[PDB]
Each structure stands twice: as C-alpha cells, then as structure tokens.
Amino acid sequence: SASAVYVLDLKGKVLICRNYRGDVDMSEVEHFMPILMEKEEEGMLSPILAHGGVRFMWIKHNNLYLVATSKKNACVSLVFSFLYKVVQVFSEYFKELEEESIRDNFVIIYELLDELMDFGYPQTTDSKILQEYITQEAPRPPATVTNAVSWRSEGIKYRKNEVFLDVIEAVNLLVSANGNVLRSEIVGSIKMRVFLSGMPELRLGLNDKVLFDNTGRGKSKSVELEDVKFHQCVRLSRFENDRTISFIPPDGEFELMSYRLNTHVKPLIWIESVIEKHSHSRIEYMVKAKSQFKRRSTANNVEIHIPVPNDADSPKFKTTVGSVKWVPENSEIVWSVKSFPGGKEYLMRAHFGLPSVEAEDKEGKPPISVKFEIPYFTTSGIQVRYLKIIEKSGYQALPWVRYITQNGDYQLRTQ
Amino acid sequence: SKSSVIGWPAVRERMRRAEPAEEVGFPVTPQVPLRPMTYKAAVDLSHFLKEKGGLEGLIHSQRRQDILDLWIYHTQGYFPDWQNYTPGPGVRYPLTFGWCYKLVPVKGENTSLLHPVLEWRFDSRLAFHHVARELHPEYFK
C-alpha cells in the first residue's frame, strides 16, 4: 500500500517523485540515502528502511532507487512486485532505464505514474495493452483494459501465424568443497513468442507426469514438475483439475510458465580443480572440465570463471583446448571454450605468482561458475506434445520451439 | 518405415541380448519435425511388424521396449510413449489407438559354475475397438 513512490539515483537526488496519498512528506526522501549510508556501512541493509514512521520500500536498479514510501502496515509484496513491474514496463518502453531515460522523457513517465497506480493500488500494469493509449508520440481506453482478459487485445492480425516457443533449461548447482552436490535443482521456463491473428485460446500439453498418471501413461517418459508458476492467462482452475494448460496468450514475447524440479542425476559437466597456493610465492590451478552430458550435444561457448587471488600476478596457462583470459578486474580467470561436446574432458593448468609480502586482509572463497549453453537438449526431458490453436475464425498456425539448456546458479564451492 | 529396416536385426539383437526377466540429459535431433506415433503410421508399423518379422511370439519385456522406443525417436522422430500397455491385471492391451498387438503372458557363460514376461498377439481390431479403453474407461473420457 503505497503513499509516495520515488526514484533516486546513486547520489540520492530525486529523479522523479510521485505521491499517491500525501501521507508521506515529499522531503522525507532526503533522509533515506544517509540512512542508506547508515544501514549499509553498519551492514544492517534491508530493502525496507524507516525514518520514524515512514517506511522506505526500495529496490535498486543500475543507477536507480525505486523508493516507495509508506507509513501504515502496508502490504509489502504488493509494493515490490509493483516495483519490478515498473522496472519492467520502463524496460518495455525505454530499452535502457537510466538517468537519461527519466529526465528526457518526463512527459510520459509522470503519466505512467498516474496510470499504473492510484492511491497505492496498482490497477493497470500490463504494458502491452498500456501502449495503446499511453504513447510517447489521447483516445479512449481499450476494452481489454476494462476486460477480465487484460493481456490480449482483439483484432490483432498478422499475415502468417507463428507461435515461437523457447523451452529454456537453467541448471542450478551447488557442489561443496567436499565434491558432493548439495543443491542441483532445475528451474525451467517456457517463454512464448506469439504472432497470431485475432483472439486464440491456446491449449498446451507436455509430457507431464501427473497428466500421464491421469492418462495411465505413467511408465513412459514423463517429466515431474515439482512446482510451476504460470502466467495469469493460464486458467489455473482449469489446470488445477486435470493438468490442463489452457490460456489465451498475449501478443508477442512472454514467459508463460515457470517450472521447477529437482534432479538427482549428475551435473552435465563435472569440474575438478586444485589450488597450489604457495605462501608468498605462487598458485597453481590444474583444472579439468569433463562433460557428463550427451556426446551428440555440445556445450556452446562455455566460460569457466575461477576466482583467483587479487594480488595474483604473472599468469601462466597450460590449457588443452580453449583459451584463458585472466580477469583481474573480477580477480579471476575465464577459461573459455567455444565448442565443448559431451563426453569431452579438457584440462587447464594455471600458474600465477604471489607477492612475497602478504596482503593486509582476507578475501573469502567464491565458487566457480561456468557459462555453458547446450541447445536442443532437455536435461529434465520435458517434451511439448502439441499446441492446440483454437480460433473462432479458424486458422492453421505455425507452432515452433527450440530447446536450450543453460546454467541457473552453477556454483561449485572451491577449496 | 525405411530407416527402421537397417536396425531391424541390429536393435532387436540388443533387445535379445537384453535380459527380459557418463550420460545425463536428453538430446533432440535438430530441425527434424516430431509427432506421436499416429494411427495410420501405427497401421503402417503393425504391418511393418507383420511383414518384416522376428517380433511375433517374442518374449516381450520393458527393457526391450525402452531400447525400441528411443530408437524410434532418434531414427524416425516419434514420441517414445506409444508402446504403453495396460498394467498387470488383465491382458496387457495397448493404450495406443492403432497398435494391433496385444501382450498376453507366455551368450550362456554368464551362468555360474555349480549354482550355489509377455509376448505379442496380433489383433487388428485393437486399432478400431480400443480394448484398453474397455479396461480403462475413466482415463480416456
């Protein structure tokens, strides 16, 4: 429940200010950044601050502090979900969102603040429908704005009828220093790119375990979705009954669903690294990278980020296949391999020096994160079975999909 | 069912060397269109199994099924959930609309020194009269 949502910069001056209740004074914003200087430098940083009775809900963009202020017991997730939405809608309008995006385009942005929220109550936040009466280039509001279907306007027409799906895997991994997998879940996310005519109701079916269990095909290949979070447009009451992915999509690119599942099978690529940290002297990383995944599959453009010490110096790299760049700016090495097929196992032998004087303070142990990408490859084994195009006009669309497996949080805790 | 001829003795050998009683993930063949085992193609396959031979009266098992089904997916592009049959109680009827084969119940040196299961049956009305639907009415609506 917002009263005054503000946008600050890295200095703390107001990029744009907008109140919704008047219950928070407009000059309260000048205490936030010193309290932000306070809480951070004592490590008491929270996304909510408090100068007396004014509560400072804020997120942080590249430059920006979307500070939403309130005083009462406001609904908190109501605030921040709107905060990332305003970032999103600005990202929908302004291809980069910085200080240039605000001060040059205050014509539209204040109008967005008038439109997205009244009183602290977000009422219209779908940017695609918002484009139709809030332009930076006014007519009546659309019926889709009035309509319960609030994501897809009628009369959308294309020459072709293309449904572009992107079943994207994101492998999380937590391997400790012991070499055991602590947490390796997979958060996959199907993101749709719809180019369709009119108002279609798309009905999707996958190799769901429960839907095959309801069918009686719970012995064949069936992915087990531990939880999915869907779009609004999915009629979840229809899905709650019988695993039915039925929806009217919006037009264009959108993530429909967000599935999450655990997987007790191996990581696609196992890393073995060593550290010969010689005191005052040097360090050595004889790191290998074996691919456990399928040999037909190839891990594209992998980027193995191994955290090196800060005052590490004189780099030497005995690779096998793939180049190293040393990034002292991140105090690390990126042993990059472009093409790395399954079954392959490439070593890299790193060698730095170390100053004969010690440093003053500790550094801590960041894990190793790599940046693999494997196309045409569902590690969880999810398969889209069909996509029912249902139009009252009636057409034969072109449904299309590609499979891409990337990392989620691919952290492997170092020595 | 042309490229299903070149592995017709080869994969069946791996089925027969499989007992009827590393790697991670699932690759997908690029740019090849995928579809389930359709009715007329199952009619094209049940006659492909009727004509090429070596299948009828063989000891059916699940390990042989999974060797077979993934080979269909990787060489012909068909979803490997089509060789599903009804469970334990009753005749193992296929849930597939178009599969005319029902499943009725029936090297050598890997043995130690001194020592201290289904089969097909052709039923051409399984394509029309879905007997597995008679065994599972509430699942098929």
Binding site: Y386, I389, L398, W400, V401 | Q31
Partner: peptide
Amino acid sequence: TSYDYCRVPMEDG
C-alpha cells in the same frame, strides 16, 4: 536467434 526452430503437432489426439 541463431538456433533454429522445430514444429510441434497441433492436436495430438
């Protein structure tokens, strides 16, 4: 998008 698409069925009856 340098990767290419693959067409799914429509109905899967």
